């Protein structure tokens, strides 16, 4: 039984001022490097224990002992994502009901049905890049976010955001981005009722109303038309949970759609951006991935079966998720009093946060070369130890979107490598912006067309 380490304190504010940074995950990784596998983080009114080792994270991932917790940021995201799958407690009726309804819509088999819509948006990205002039460059996270938002709009509810036709966001997206920023900023406030935050609060309520009004109209329009498109909205209007025998109600459908738009905007685009960063910094890897794309993608339009054959492109994406897991943390609570790792006693209800970038740097698992980008670590999936690699979370509360995200990212990266050579023309220095997720801010490249028709 040991006392855990704790970072530097600020008197009556305890550790709370350490949250006052626009790069809080990267700040917490540096604290983990200094203090080790576990540290306590105290604020007036709450405590979190941050975990970084596979030894302790494997225990936290035992669903008989620990369940998903809503961290302060997820409690504030719940003001607009409601009891959708991401912001519900496991014990709320709507979690298991929506999980049972939606699981078949997110299976590997379901990807055959979404493939043609994903190809529509991927072709729009390739055509944008083919149409650039010699003196221009690509704004990577900006174009990846256009692509992933547009893909989930078309597969989620047959709606075209038309992100390649504008420089200014859709009204929904201005509101969603601003609401996510407010939710991510609320936990660092020592006095949330300070009148300095009144304008923030008015704008938050306004942004929630914009998102609710727009998605409620989409749902009401589809129910009126009777149209049966092969999207997630049709599946949610027609599905019934085998356990309760009930369908989702229109309020819960709205929260699921909001949740899917947050994920499409924030997560897959980060993965694609980090993958392209590591490829231009590691040209032997780029060559090996480009050789696979050329040999496999032999038709002007990729097929589902060809995307499945992009093994090395998949290894590149896993190694990008290892170093920069774009959703970089998840929270657990102790179901009962217990002892973590034979050393750290916990009370029922105690909150834990898993720092996924530190799990993925645990040299007791990955061996000594953890900061190197080496997709060959994933060449044989049976070589990865249990609970060492967790970019999609854990157990029944793991990412429902994992197969969707990896099919979209494999298709897009494969087409990018088939159609272009890439140049890091600025010698870009990695700068990681934090929203809900991690992305490489200011990352630019030049493409040179291989002149292969679509
Ligand atoms: C590379 C892309 C993605 C990554 C890295 C990722 C990561 C994660 C992680 C870490 C969790 C667990 C969160 C927690 O325990 O608090 C999660 C949950 C979730 N993700 Fe993703 N995600 C990605 C893409 C997507 C996409 C594309 C969708 C849907 C369109 C999606 C939908 C969800 C939902 C609904 C949950 C909650 C599942 C449940 O608890 O029932 N994700 N994701
Ligand atoms: C799906 C990606 C979510 C990533 C969450 C990143 C959160 C890192 C900072 C952190 O631990 N803040 C705690 C402090 C109190 O309230 C929180 O939430």
Curated annotation (Swiss-Prot):
Regions that span the bilayer: none
Top-rank taxon, per record: Bacteria
Residues that bind (9Z)-hexadecenoate: 50
Localization annotation: Cytoplasm
Site positions for Important for catalytic activity: 267
Induction (free text): By pentobarbital. Expression is negatively regulated by repressor bm3R1 at the transcriptional level.
Coiled-coil segments: none
Effect of residue 86 to V: Higher activity in the hydroxylation of highly branched fatty acids
Outcome, altering residue 263 to C: No effective fatty acid oxidation. No effect on electron transport from NADPH to FMN
Impact upon substituting residue 85 to E: Ineffective covalent modification of the heme macrocycle. Extensive formation of Fe(II)CO complex in the substrate-free form
Residues reported to bind heme: 399
Impact when changing residue 392 to W: Large decrease in the heme reduction potential in the presence and absence of substrate arachidonate. 10% reduction in efficiency to couple NADPH consumption to substrate monooxygenation
Mutagenesis or variant effect for residue 263 to H/K: No significant stimulation of NADPH oxidation induced by addition of fatty acids and no hydroxylated products, but cytochrome c reductase activity levels are identical to wild-type enzyme. More negative reduction potential with dithionite
Signal peptide bounds: none
Region ranges (Cytochrome P450): 1-454
Practical uses of the protein: This protein is a target of protein engineering. Its selectivity-directing and activity-enhancing mutations have been extensively studied and the designed mutations allow this enzyme to act on non-native substrates and/or in order to enhance production of synthetically desirable end-products.
Function: Functions as a fatty acid monooxygenase. Catalyzes hydroxylation of fatty acids at omega-1, omega-2 and omega-3 positions. Shows activity toward medium and long-chain fatty acids, with optimum chain lengths of 12, 14 and 16 carbons (lauric, myristic, and palmitic acids). Able to metabolize some of these primary metabolites to secondary and tertiary products. Marginal activity towards short chain lengths of 8-10 carbons. Hydroxylates highly branched fatty acids, which play an essential role in membrane fluidity regulation.
Family: In the N-terminal section; belongs to the cytochrome P450 family.
Protein name (record): Bifunctional cytochrome P450/NADPH--P450 reductase
Lineage per the UniProt record: Bacteria, Bacillati, Bacillota, Bacilli, Bacillales
Residues represented out of the complete protein: 3 to 456 of 1049
